[PDB]
Amino acid sequence: ERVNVNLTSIKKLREKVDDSIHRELTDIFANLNYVGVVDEERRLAAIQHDLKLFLIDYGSVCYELFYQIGLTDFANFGKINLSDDIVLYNLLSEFDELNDDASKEKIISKIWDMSSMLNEYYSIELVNDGLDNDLKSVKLKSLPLLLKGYIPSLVKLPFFIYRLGKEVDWEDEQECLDGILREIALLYIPDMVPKVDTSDASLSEDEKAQFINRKEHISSLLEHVLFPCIKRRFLAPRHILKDVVEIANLPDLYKVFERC
């Protein structure tokens, strides 16, 4: 069932992660107690470890987590199958920079050639309906399922395809595989919800309502899917230490309200 990953590059990327892990920081996450969202834009959340309150950049933690799952579960991923189909050519229209057909076609060309590799090693299924030389008809069948009960936001999907052809280096094994995992985690991390002025009368009710729903969806995802997983399998790397800040030592606050 589980395939034997004998690639020297994947073992080398795994070794780099294993060396990078900080013991005392992983201890904080392993025994965390999630409080709630602090900032949906700066992607901040609050947790309690022992009797200290911490401010955590969940975007950074989710990036390290979805890169970690991709590394350990390499070439053994599930599938997220998608009337309401997604076209690769029409997806890149959100970029004014691509002022040519040959520029939009060059991204798809590199990806479709490596479709056999992308479908096998990552579960990124790419299916074409038209001619082998034609690129406008190339679509995306399924994406890897790293976490059960978690479907990523497709807002970052045109950016994922743009960075899949223009960023990912297809000329070196390790750098190609390291780049793809980095591109998946970047897509998989929960989206940023930029602050919308509710008190302002100039903005419509529907704009205000969707911003509230975006906030609701992120809090729910963190409480039920993201943070339980983080507390179970996340291994904190030394570099993430700047994104874990102590905001309060609760014993000090007990003195303030000791005698009512």
């Binding site: 409080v35 609050a46 309690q48 309150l53 009512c260």
Partner: protein, 222 residues
Amino acid sequence: GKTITDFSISRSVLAKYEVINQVDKKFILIRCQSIHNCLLVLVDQHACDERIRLEELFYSLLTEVVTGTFVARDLKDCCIEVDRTEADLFKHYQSEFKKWGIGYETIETSLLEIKTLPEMLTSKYNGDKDYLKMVLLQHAHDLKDFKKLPMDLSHFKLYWWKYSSCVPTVFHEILNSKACRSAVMFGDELTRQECIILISKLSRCHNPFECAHGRPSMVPIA
């Protein structure tokens, strides 16, 4: 028309706050664009609930007193020995004591015949004529020494806090205790919905920044 700008800033701060969630079953972590003097604040849940409760208790008492609907339970065979000057002090402020349901008559060495007491005080004194004497003297001396102004009922919404200072210490203490006992405690479970209601209600209080016993209700951590 000129007004002191510093009074308005303090009120608008808590009104622009969103609840994160309960912390350690002891606090409510809250979060605040346009940050002059307002980010993360830890609110003591007990102090928060007690504050809402006290202002509700003060509003009730004063609306009852102002409208002349403050209940006064009839007291039987209650007479206390008083000084010549003490009998004079009570004779003078008899009308003022009647505003709180403390109805009495001065006889004559002298004596004090208490006819009525509000249920709040009937319960507290509990037959102790010495406690009742100390407490009525306490208010009589507060009125005399200008430590407490009299109740101005010459006025026909009601702002209880514009009559707050007039409340006798004995009633103040009683309501503080009622608020404290009825309030949520440390170790108690609060849902986010329960926390939202508490902070929403606290922001509608005249003084949200302290408990009944004058200690702070919240601490900023950012």
